[PDB]
Design a protein around this nucleic acid. Structure first.
Length: 153
DNA sequence: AGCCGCGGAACAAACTTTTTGATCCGCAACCTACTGGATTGCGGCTCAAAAAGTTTGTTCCGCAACTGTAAATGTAATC
């Protein structure tokens, strides 16, 4: 249900398909409060609209498990601590490779386990319009970027 | 996600500084007067030889910031 409605709005999907839209990413760096520089790659002002639309399309047939207050609608940071108020101890994990190592190979099989079917052309569309190429070269390695509007879901 | 020059390193032949195992030669001893044989013996001193201790020329190992079309965004706070 992605390729069917892709050309309905802004019928320019014929172009920008072969012109490496994943490359359309600006890289800057924000200073942390302490040691560290955070690289952020965000799409051009045009790609974010397409990514938001495809997020809305994807949300039609998905389910997100509870106890994961990670960017779900109407759930601020307070409910994260509301569950944890009655405890006495805590063990805080912190995952490494912040969103920059989630390859597209690990999303299609995740959806397959999720029991949702996706077309091969739709799979190519997902791989091409919702990821970032750091090497900026053809047939490169695709990694999710911290900053894309499609990163949370 | 790829891998620049830089500098230690893991090895490995050459120098190089002593550990050892004889050989010697005064050197006081016998013996008796004194070179006594036709003698031993005994302790410093020196000898290369070789098992130990550096020293130096070569070969891989590792690692950083960002990449070719590309966002200035009123306030606070999250990954």
């Amino acid at each position: 249900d992605i390729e069917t409605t892709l050309q309905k709005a802004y019928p320019d999907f014929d172009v920008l398909l072969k012109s490496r839209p994943a490359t359309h990413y600006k890289v800057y760096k924000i200073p942390k409060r302490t040691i560290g520089y955070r690289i952020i790659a965000q799409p051009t002002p045009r790609v974010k609209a397409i990514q938001r639309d495809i997020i809305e399309i994807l949300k039609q047939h998905t389910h997100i498990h509870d106890a994961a207050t990670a960017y779900v609608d109407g759930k601020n940071i307070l409910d994260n601590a509301k569950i944890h108020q009655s405890s006495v101890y805590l063990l805080k994990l912190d995952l490494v490779n912040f969103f920059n190592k989630i390859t597209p190979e690990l999303l299609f099989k995740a959806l397959a386990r999720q029991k949702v079917d996706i077309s091969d052309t739709n799979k190519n569309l997902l791989k091409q319009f919702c990821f970032w190429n750091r090497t900026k070269r053809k047939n490169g390695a695709l990694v999710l970027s911290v900053g894309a509007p499609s990163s949370p879901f």
